[PDB]
Design a protein around this ligand. Structure first.
Ligand SMILES: *C(=O)N1C[C@H](NOS(=O)(=O)O)CC[C@H]1C(N)=O
Length: 263
């Protein structure tokens, strides 16, 4: 709808920064709306979804098992480690760590998961082999959140992420059991309250992953639809604004309110 685009433009005016936007039909993969679709934005914590997609790919092939227990130490703990800092004694399974990475955005969990697959480059190789020659992860947490302007490291485009997400959630890449583990983790997101979730009517489905970085970076990827069943993918990124966090949260909410009302 023109008026959802108008809200994206107004959000650009009021934040004083670039905003990338993609609305994708889950069934056919056709783009319903777009704004700056081929411009790069920092992925920030939204990459954790693509990371757990790579891990589930290894689980399918038998190179990884969801129950394998990983033991680490305080050393591996990096800033924002809400769950991993509580399991220094018993360790955590791959399944629990991916749950921590997506539902709580645990940073140490992400670094541990990156180690099991062979580092950021090997995640990029994973995305490359499924048809994403645009998205790239280059650094570990928390360095990947610097969001230096014009730096292409740890970036995606609204169109590339939205298509890759669609393949991960509904494509032929993962098995049915693996596809549902990723969507279940995303549905259990507990850190994207004031974003798209704030504008959701009762009975709607949402499975999302949010993120923020430096230089006013904020973003969300989401699978949502009415009556508890997803039907579209929404990708929203922004960077460059000197806005406070609560301000950036407000615009993504108004973008959410618009596309829900003109669903
Ligand atoms: C993801 O971008 N991050 C991890 C954590 N918050 O995730 S959230 O903003 O989606 O809820 C801390 C902030 C950020 C980071 N600096 O890693």
């Amino acid at each position: 709808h023109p008026e959802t685009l108008v809200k994206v433009k107004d959000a650009e005016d009021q934040l004083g920064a670039r905003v990338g936007y993609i609305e994708l039909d889950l069934n056919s993969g056709k783009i319903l709306e777009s704004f700056r679709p081929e411009e790069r934005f920092p992925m920030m914590s939204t990459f954790k979804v693509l990371l757990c997609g790579a891990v589930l790919s290894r689980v399918d092939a038998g190179q990884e098992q969801l129950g394998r227990r990983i033991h680490y130490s305080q050393n591996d703990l990096v800033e924002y480690s809400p769950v991993t800092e509580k399991h220094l004694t018993d360790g955590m399974t791959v399944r629990e760590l991916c749950s921590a990475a997506i539902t709580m955005s645990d940073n140490t969990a992400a670094n541990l998961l990156l180690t099991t697959i062979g580092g950021p480059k090997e995640l990029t190789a994973f995305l490359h082999n499924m048809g994403d020659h645009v998205t790239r992860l280059d650094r570990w947490e928390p360095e990947l959140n610097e969001a230096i302007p014009n730096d292409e490291r740890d970036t995606t485009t609204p169109a590339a992420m939205a298509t890759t997400l669609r393949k991960l959630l509904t494509g032929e890449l993962l098995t049915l059991a693996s596809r549902q583990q990723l969507i279940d983790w995303m549905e259990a997101d507990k850190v994207a309250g004031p974003l798209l979730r704030s504008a959701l009517p009762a009975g709607w489905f949402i499975a999302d992953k949010s993120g923020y970085g430096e230089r006013g970076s904020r973003g969300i990827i989401a699978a949502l639809g009415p009556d508890g069943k997803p039907s579209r993918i929404v990708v929203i990124y922004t960077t460059g604004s000197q806005a406070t966090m609560d301000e950036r949260n407000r615009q993504i909410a108004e973008i959410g309110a618009s596309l829900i009302k003109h669903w």
